[PDB]
Amino acid sequence: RPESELIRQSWRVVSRSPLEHGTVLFARLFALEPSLLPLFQYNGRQFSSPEDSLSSPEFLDHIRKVMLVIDAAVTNVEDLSSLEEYLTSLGRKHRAVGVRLSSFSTVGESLLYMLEKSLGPDFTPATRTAWSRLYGAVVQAMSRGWDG
Ligand code: HEM
Ligand SMILES: [Kr]
Ligand SMILES: [Kr]
Ligand SMILES: [Kr]
Numbered sequence: 001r002p003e004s005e006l007i008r009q010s011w012r013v014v015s016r017s018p019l020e021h022g023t024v025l026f027a028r029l030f031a032l033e034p035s036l037l038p039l040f041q042y043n044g045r046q047f048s049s050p051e052d053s054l055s056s057p058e059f060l061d062h063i064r065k066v067m068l069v070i071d072a073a074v075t076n077v078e079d080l081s082s083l084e085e086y087l088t089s090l091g092r093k094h095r096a097v098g099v100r101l102s103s104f105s106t107v108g109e110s111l112l113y114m115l116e117k118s119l120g121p122d123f124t125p126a127t128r129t130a131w132s133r134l135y136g137a138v139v140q141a142m143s144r145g146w147d148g
Pocket of ligand 1 (some may be wrong): 103
């Protein structure tokens with residue numbers, strides 16, 4: 001497929017420096033939906049401001065975890081049925097920590113922002129569409145962790 005190749009080629013640029021790029025993703029996320037900030041409770045404590053999260057080793061480890069899941073999806077773009085059970089369970093975990101399913105649309109927009117800003121003119125409307133489709137498929141699998 002041509003979509004699969006657009007995804008693999010664009011990801012190569014981002015996966016070079018996953019923490020730097022995942023930092024952009026989460027900075028954008030908290031700018032759009034500040035109410036996600038209290039859901040990261042490490043040591044029973046809440047971050048006051050978004051910049052507090054960037055000093056937290058546990059938060060930065062979660063950025064790495066995110067980028068690893070996306071890497072797995074890109075690696076398996078031709079057949080995502082293999083990640084399906086893992087993703088359902090990842091959904092259940094996030095439901096448990098208190099993330100609402102509607103917040104994953106904001107995460108998607110933040111991912112697209114991070115890609116747009118990293119790729120500049122190489123972020124074509126075809127590339128956007130491809131990533132939207134891939135992210136949609138990931139979220140569909142995760143959404144089974146909220147039942148359905
Ligand atoms: C609103 C968005 C999100 C919030 C508030 C959130 C929050 C959390 C929290 C609190 C944990 C448990 C503590 C930790 O391991 O750091 C967690 C675990 C995790 N999250 Fe997220 N997360 C979000 C989105 C995502 C996304 C989009 C992905 C991947 C695509 C992701 C992947 C993970 C993974 C892999 C774990 C470890 C799961 C395990 O216990 O095996 N998270 N997340
Ligand atoms: Kr952040
Ligand atoms: Kr993401
Ligand atoms: Kr994705």
